[PDB]
Structure formats: C-alpha cells, structure tokens
Amino acid sequence: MSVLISGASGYIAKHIVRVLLEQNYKVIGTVRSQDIADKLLKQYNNPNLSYEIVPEIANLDAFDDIFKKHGKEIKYVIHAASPVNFGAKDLEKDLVIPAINGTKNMFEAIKKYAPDTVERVVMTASYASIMDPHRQNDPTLTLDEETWNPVTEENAYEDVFTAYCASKTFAEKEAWKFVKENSDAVKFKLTTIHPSFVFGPQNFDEDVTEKLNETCEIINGLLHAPFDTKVEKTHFSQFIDVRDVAKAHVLGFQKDELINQRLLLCNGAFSLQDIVNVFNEDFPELKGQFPPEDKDTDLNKGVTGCKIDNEKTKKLLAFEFTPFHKTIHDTVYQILHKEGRV
Template identity: 50%
Template structure:
C-alpha cells in the first residue's frame, strides 16, 4: 500500500519513513527543495519504494495539488507531519500560525478533491501543545488528558514564540477534526492525531547531527555543551522518544481501534537536572565539563504543577514507552560519537 508523508525530511518524519520502508510500504514523501530530495534519496540508499515530491511551502493553497494529481489514485494513507517547529520568531502569524493551519487544511482539501475514494486513513501530527494550556501548567489541580484542548486564542497567543507555537498546533489539529466532521459525506478517510510531548532520541542518520539540532533535541545538545559553572534552569516539560512517536504514527493508520482518536504519546516529566544526572552518570568524559547541578533533586522542580494523564493512549497503543534514561542516553551517544568524544 502507498503512504504519503508530508515533511519527510523532518526529525520525526525520517524515523516514520524508515519504519514504513522496513514494513514494505511504498512511500511518497514531500520535501521543500531539490537539495533535500537528493540528500534523502541518497540517505535511504535509493530505496526503490521511496518517491519524493517537492512542496516548497505548505501554506500555499495549491501546495499539494500536483502531488495528488500525480499520485492521488494510489494513496491509501496520509501522514501530515510538516509544520513549523521553532520559537525564535516574532512573525507569529506568518511563520507559525498560518503555515500550521493552512498546511493542514490544504492537504485535507487536496485529499477531498483528488483522492476522496482512495484515502482510507489520515494521521495528523499534532502535539501535546494542542492539549496543554500554558497558563495552567503550574496549577497542581489540573490534569491534561486526551480530551483537553489548549485554550489559547488566535489573538492572545501572539505574545512570544512559545505561546504562538503551542497555539499553532491547536488551531491546526482543530481544523483537521472540523474538516473530518464537516466533510463526512464527501470523504472516506478516518482521522487520527498523534500528540507527542517533547521528542528526544537520535537523529535517524548520524550525518544530520550538527551544531544546532531540531528544537526538542537541542535541549539535550545544549546541556551537553553547557559550561561546568552553569546552573540548570527550572524549565521542565514532558518527554517522549522519537522511535515511539514513529511507531504511534504507524499504529495510527494500521489499527482499527485508533481511528477517531487523539494519541497522546508521552512518558512523563523531566527537567534539566534529570538530563544532567543521566549525562554525568553515563558519560564520564562529561564530568567536570558540564554542570553537575544538585544530583537527584530533579523532582523538586518537576513534581509541582499540572500533570498529564495519557493512560487511555498507553492502553490503546499497548507498548512500553522508552524511558528518559534511554532516550537521553541514545541522543547523547550519537552526539558524542559525531564529535569524537565517545
């Protein structure tokens, strides 16, 4: 069967493409440029089941038209992963909100127009940021679940990159559910969303480890390169591993019981101190080179505040999520190998 995946060059998407190819799917990926196309084809060793099309900007209303004109008749599953993920902008609408929202609407409209009868399942990569209301994260009485929605509005989210990114994912996901409901009589597909927390883990290819990594892995990369006299920040969040997130994307279209669901893929809280403890314990070459902080005190930072309960998703997916230790360890091993510091 043929799977279309948007944003195939992304950190998470590469792991999904790899798992799809291993399971013998024909994969049509979209990337933004010829250079990325050539690079990916080389990295996947010109796998005959991998086809790449160029979609320079998902915000353009006709972004996916050509892809569907050419391949629509054979695409059975669509995974929409592409969306801007960075905080470093003040152009909140142009850089974050509009591409996230319009990109989602554009791919869904192209399915309806060109592949309404052939596409059976659609998976939109959403995020825990579509679930979590930032203003409530320090309230210990709050529990976020598969039912929760970020309460940000289009106007009030435009205060900083983090708030705008969080909201961009909420508006995009909401548009997907609205689309599925409003077009129920005109489309065949069932929708599933995958809502990961911050995603760690190795890049699929060592060569993609560079000075600055994708937004989530950069948290670990930053601590590996933090000066010994630095102090860990009080920032904390929830994490998951990229290989689990990729697996969830496959189950999201392969299994009947995931149709219509929001899959919240997360394995608990973490803070800087927890990551530093793992780095200092597992990698003696980092001792005295990176901060030590106050080992063992991570939960003093992470335990207060709101919690996320994704027991419904855990039960549904039925596999064990990778631990913080494993995901941080594997991320660091790859970075240190690339820097000849193993």
Template identity: 50%
Template sequence: MTTKEITVFVSGATGFIALHVVHDLLKAGYKVIGSGRSQEKNDGILKKFNNNPNLSMEIVKDIAIPNAFDDVFQRRGREIKVVLHIASPVHFKTTDFEKDLLIPAVNGTKSILEAIKKYAADTVEKVVVTSSVAALANNIDIKNNNLVITEESWNKDTWESCQADAVAAYCGSKKFAEQAAWNFLKENQSSVKFTLSTINPGFVFGPQMFADSLKDGINSSSGIIAQLVRSKTGGKFYNYSGPFIDVRDVSKAHLAAFENSECAGERLLLSEDLFCSQEALDILNEEFPQLKGKITAGEPGSGPSFLEKNSCRFDNSKTKKLLGFKFHNFRDCIVDTASQMLEVQNEALN
C-alpha cells in the first residue's frame, strides 16, 4: 500500500507540534484529516497549506466532553488507518486542576480510543499518542541528580498528590492520559486491531511551522526562549532545566512511530540532551550581535555545573536506536527558534 492510499487522522492539528506533523505527512504523500476547535481555525490551517487536496479538517470543539470524537469517526472512521492523538490541554493558569487539566487529558484520550472502537475497529491499524517526559517523572524527580530516567520510567505522583500545583497537575495529566491509553488497549484487545506507541518529548523548542503563528501566542517551551530574547541587561530570569528536543524531530518521530513496526508497543523518549536557560542565553549572546549587551547575560558558562546539581539523567538509547535518525543539537535549535522570533518582531516594528 502506498502512502497515497493511507489516511492519517491528527487530533489538535492546529497546535505547535501538530502543524509540523501535518506538514511532514503531506510531504510524504499521506492523506490527512485534522481536527481543530472551530471552523475559523480549520479554515486558517487549510489556507496555510494552500488548500492541499490531501488535507481536510473536522471540528472537535472540546476534547474533554464524553464522545468528543464520535461524530468524526462515525462519518469518516472507515477512511482512517492511522490515528495520531496530539491534542491535550497545556496551560498553567488554573486552580481547578481536575477540571482544567487532569479530566480533559484523560477524557480526550479515552474518547478518541472509544470512537475508534465504535466506528473504526477494523480500519485503524496504528495509534500514536503524544505524551510527555512528564509522564516519566514528576517536576520534583526531574531535578533529582541521582535519578536516571528511561523509557520504562513512570511519574510516581498519584491523582491526589499531583494536584499540589499547576505544574504538578500538568505532569500528572500526561501520566494518567498515557496510562488510560495503555489500559484501554489491554482491556479491548479482542475488539480493536490497532497497535499503540507513545511519544514522550522533553521541552520542545524549534521554529514554528508558520512564522505568523507567533502572533497568536506561543507554546510554553518556546515561551522560555521568548522571555530570554525579551529580557533586559542584568535582569533576572528563571533557570529552567531538563531534557530538550527540537519540534522537527518530534514530528519525524510521529511518522516513524507508525511507519516502523518495531515501534509498536513502545514509548519513545525524545531527548537530545539536557539544557538549562543559562545555556540558551549564552547561545543568544554569542550568535545574535543585535541582542548582545541588550539582554541579560546571567552567569555565562555556568550551565553545565548547574545541570549537574539540578537535573536527573536520561538514557534514551533504546529510542535513538529505534528511530535511527540524528536529533538537532541545542545550538541549531535555539538559533532557528530565536531567528524566527526576531524576524517576526522586526516585521511588526516596520
């Protein structure tokens, strides 16, 4: 079967990672059905992809409501061979963690799998769920320098303990949504035929698929770089740290997860290396003469010693072997991210 005969459903197709995935799928010759929250958003995406005949969009207003995906799969499930479930809530402006983070993430995952079971049990062969490093370790363990995280690791928070604050709740939402997917497959093996893989990226940096997306707000990881680009000389900044990956590699991994049969049943831990904000600042000051002297410098060169004390280690050699391609390094990733931001900023000023 050629890629032209395979239709891939992408939930949350209007998001940062998903736009890259849609681009890569179309480039590879797949037919793509994406979901977005509104007709306006969907029309915007179709326009961005020049009304590509291989791309169509469907409205899924709210992934958190029961049976959110039933309508789409009832009408179009027979066309779909691969499902990439990328939609999930990512925001920290809430105090009702169950209502705004935990329940939507879990329900969204369950409802897409239920829709497959009801309407596309014989046609959907592969499902890939976009999870996170947050499903592997909570926000305290990720800073523990005695800990090594692998593809087998799980965030040890409970439903109750992850409600300590918004960041812990976000991490918990990724864990419980991913567990819901694995449990669903275990319980429904006789009534569905799909294999499951998950993608577990660290902080995702890299350029937006379309530069004008930066005008509509920004994903939380890229927001870290935006804050540094906008910082002032001598200003304070929060030194974020953890594993990072370029969005272009996350996208490639989504395709590999269903194209390579060895990825079936696997959790793919996406991390090129550890990073901290100080290292990103060093790169910005070295690579962009227009920023040097205008943005904060922090303590140049102190990144590696900070990471040694403040970050756990990651061993994703299994994932790297399965995927078989080289990830973007941190410098290239930050330069490409910041170049695009500065370009859009300059356009806004002119």
C-alpha cells in the first residue's frame, strides 16, 4: 500500500507528501541528491517517509532502480517530477527533454518491473496542456477537460513560457499514448492533474527563502518590489491554491471516478495588481513598503479572459477550492511572519 512520488522536494510535492503522511501512507519520494533527502527527512521527521535518489529524470531508465528494490510494495505512483524554470538556458534540454523523458522513463519502469503491481498513476500535468497560450485574453475561447494546447514542435520555442507549456503538453501526450497502447500489458489506471498558476504557502516555513519556486516568486518579487514599480493590471492567467492541488493528487488514486480523467484545477482570474491589492488590503500597516493598491484591474471590471469550464472536475473532486484572497493572504503572511514583520 505504498506511494511513490517523483520530484518530492518541489513546492507542490512537499504538500502532497504531507497529505499522504497525514493519511498514514508509506511514502517513497525521489530527489536529486543525498543532502536534499537529509534535509527533507529531518523536516518531516516521520518513520513512514523514505527517499530514493534519482538525480536526473531525463536519463535512460532513471526509475528502474526504485522498482528494482521497491516494486513489490508500490501500489500507487505520483509522477510530479518536471522542470518549472522560466529562466531556462536551453529550452529543449532544460524543459522539453526532461518532461518527456521523465514521463517515458517512469511508465516504462512500471511496465518492465511492476506491470501487475501498481494500481494507479497520478501524473502532474498542467493547465498549460489545456489552455492556448496565444488566447488567454480571449473571452470567446472556452476550455474544458478535453481541450488541448494546440502547440506544435515547430512553434514550441517561441519563448521560455511557450516552451514550458509545450513540455507539459508533449509529456502528457506521451503518457496517454502509453496508456492506450499498453492497456493490456499494464494494470494501472492514469489520472492527470492540470493546475494553473499555483500559489499558497510553502509547506515548511523555513523553506521561505530569498528566492522561491517560480510561480510563488511572482508573489515574493512583487512583495519586495520598490513602491514605484510598474505592476500590470490586465488579465494575467488562472490560479489555484497549492493545498487544493495536493489534495486533488491524493484523491486521484483513491477515487474510481477519477480514472482516465484530466482534472482542470483553476479557481479564478487575476492580474499582478490584484495580488498587490492583497498586500495593501490585508497588511495596511506596511503600505508604502510595496507597490500601492489599485482596484482598477481587469478582474474588478469583470474581464477574466478565456472561459474555464471545469464543472466536471469540481464535481468529480467534490471539494471546494480555496478563494484567491485567502491563497494570496496565506502566502504573504508566511513570508512576512518569517521576516519578523507581522
């Protein structure tokens, strides 16, 4: 009844491991190096938690060693390892290749060593593999759980963001392709989670460092920006709380109605100024120490960009999502409380 989760040191995965441990699961996480494993084991301080070392998912057969040693005992797999680096130097190598190869390596290791053992696979895809990056401010476009990013390998490398979205899209394509062709060879059922911009507090307060993970560094950077910094007010994208994402991942392998499902995790439109407005609204004693408030955003006049039809996802998950104001507030409080300012 064990749960294996790849990339267990990331922002989202650290919340997934907490949720798995709260439900008294035996968890095997994969991390790059021994020192990361040593710090995480000390942080969780839980006998049910162990870590295996996978230093690079892009590389041939990266996950056979785990299923070599642990195959008999692994019942669920959560494939969350994928690079989120909007400062990538080499778009293929740093985003596309690890995303695709990591997913291919994980599924082949299951097929080779635990074909009749693993029951469910929950893969962390992205809203990026459902949305169209060129049409996020298009109110005529409606996105649901069957929509696909139309990006091609030809136009995937427009910039670092389109490359990341293509890496998520191409990786999820390979996963579903693997499932359709190996349906009689392997036993497991596949579920994919598609979060948008994930905000929320870090699972551990001490992980609040100078530079956070990419999406939460959006909030952190704005929180420490000079007062005269330009903040955009036009519609940016969709958000989701990290605690909702972690919860959805665990339900992904417990609930039979989530089998063969793509789960679109969004809970509202926002701009960078709407985030800044939470700084000024919830912590007014620090007004002037970050960009000022301005209620005149796209969101506040009803402009929310492309339509999100995830009623199927919300129905199947059957739990309520965390609203935007609370998500940003909990993120900001953790940083300010860590700095000793509130």
